[PDB]
Design a protein around this ligand. Sequence first.
Ligand SMILES: Nc1nc2c(ncn2[C@H]2C[C@H](O)[C@@H](COP(=O)(O)OP(=O)(O)OP(=O)(O)O)O2)c(=O)[nH]1
Ligand SMILES: [Ca+2]
Ligand SMILES: [Ca+2]
Ligand SMILES: [Ca+2]
Ligand SMILES: [Ca+2]
Ligand SMILES: [Cl-]
Ligand SMILES: [Zn+2]
Length: 575
Amino acid sequence: MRNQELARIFEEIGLMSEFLGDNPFRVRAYHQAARTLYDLDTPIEEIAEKGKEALMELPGVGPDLAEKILEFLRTGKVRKHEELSRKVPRGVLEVMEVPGVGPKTARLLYEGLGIDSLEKLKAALDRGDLTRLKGFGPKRAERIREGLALAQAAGKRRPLGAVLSLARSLLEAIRALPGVERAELCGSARRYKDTVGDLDFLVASREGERAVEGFVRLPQVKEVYAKGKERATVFLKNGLQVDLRVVPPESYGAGLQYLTGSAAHSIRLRALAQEKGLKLSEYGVFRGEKRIAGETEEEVYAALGLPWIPPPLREDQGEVEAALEGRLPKLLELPQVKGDLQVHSTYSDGQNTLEELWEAAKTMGYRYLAVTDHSPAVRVAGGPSPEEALKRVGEIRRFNETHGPPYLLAGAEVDIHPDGTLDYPDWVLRELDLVLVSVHSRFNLPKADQTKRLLKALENPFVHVLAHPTARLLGRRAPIEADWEAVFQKAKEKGVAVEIDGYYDRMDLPDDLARMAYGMGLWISLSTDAHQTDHLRFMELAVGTAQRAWIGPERVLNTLDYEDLLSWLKARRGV
Ligand SMILES: Nc1nc2c(ncn2[C@H]2C[C@H](O)[C@@H](COP(=O)(O)OP(=O)(O)OP(=O)(O)O)O2)c(=O)[nH]1
Ligand SMILES: [Ca+2]
Ligand SMILES: [Ca+2]
Ligand SMILES: [Ca+2]
Ligand SMILES: [Ca+2]
Ligand SMILES: [Cl-]
Ligand SMILES: [Zn+2]
């Protein structure tokens, strides 16, 4: 559909027209045309095919607008929009759209103050320049600064784990709206993508317009950006940018599929539908005018002749073909994970004692937890020394002797020196239950040198896991450059697992490299890199990553029970 694209075009024409000081009647008309297109559920092209008169039946559309609709459908553009674009630059249009600014103010700001950009706008805000205009007080001042921040965030992405719990708190409030029967967090978040744009929620309701009203008036909501009969876009007090879509309860499953995407996955499904005489839309699966499916997502997949496809797979990267042949991959599931294989403690940089870690693991129903404190070079500190590291092993063993399950594995996260040697001697490594190795320095070695360093680390027969291999920090540090094929192949041959560290701003291995490692036949270790017990919740992110990477419970260390895990760790591994 081109409905939303055209709604935007007319809205922009309205804004630019008002900026230029066109007829307020014409300005309001463009905005009403925009609302109509925003709310219109049927494709605008289907009405356009019926003719100019049919377009004019729509609320707000007259002879002028109907010709512009046809122009857009025939050429892909509207010359009027292009004409106003010649008179109104992009930066000045960006300024006017900030909440609390608007077209007329933007004109004064353009002509009198020299503000043609968000940059200048922020400069003015920060210096108090705007306070020297009539109509400007601390209330409007606060709105404009915040509007600017929201504008600048809308381009950008945040780690999934930075926003998922906040999204779930909003989901609770949405579910609690009277009139809402079901709701779900959809979009890329439901697919467990490691960074997300806006958050998208689907609601089932028989009273959609009233559900939208309740939603936009939730205590959590700060600003409404767009609102109509069945959808809204808002900004929360906590910053989150959120889209809502409402469908009738009979359509909920089709709405879930629609709003979960990816868009590429949905293109595949719509073609499969039409190839068997059906139409898939947000509202259901239809044979002619008759709705034959829609209430549940599994019913929708079934109507297309498919098994239900897990959301993390829905990227058009082989899942449609696998579903068509009745051979979807077996995927790791969160209940199958029996422990977390990288947690830190007060022996190094963690906030928790052994007792606190044990208690948290016991609450979670884990069989074990690996306490993997840093070697001295990681912390850029003096210790723990090799002697202290061994003393700690004895303490963890005594803790297990006095506590029982969940058992603590006495581990370490051992720094890899620039030359590929390890930051504990073999007499420490051999006594550890679990040896992780990782890069914490010299992140920018030439690719060939970084590769050699990692290969040399993997020579050591006491190593079990390559921890957070790329060392990336989302928003702070790029992945290290290394030949991952060479690194993974050596790890496979040596019996060393690669880690998926689900700590929210690590997400390392990323899904794509995890998919590569698992496809090459490696073992996988999941962890949260916890430094406080609240971090243990990130295991869901590591599992979601595994699912995106087509990883099953086979060759995942965390699906082994304690005895089987210790056996794996002690075994002659590799070729
Ligand atoms: N049929 C159809 N579905 C769409 C279209 N655009 C988006 N969708 C569906 C599939 C998307 O996964 C879902 C949410 O759209 P978003 O633009 O928010 O993307 P998504 O959440 O997947 O990724 P993001 O992290 O926000 O970049 O809506 C479209 O043009 N046609
Ligand atoms: Ca009309
Ligand atoms: Ca409710
Ligand atoms: Ca989204
Ligand atoms: Ca969206
Ligand atoms: Cl469902
Ligand atoms: Zn580390």
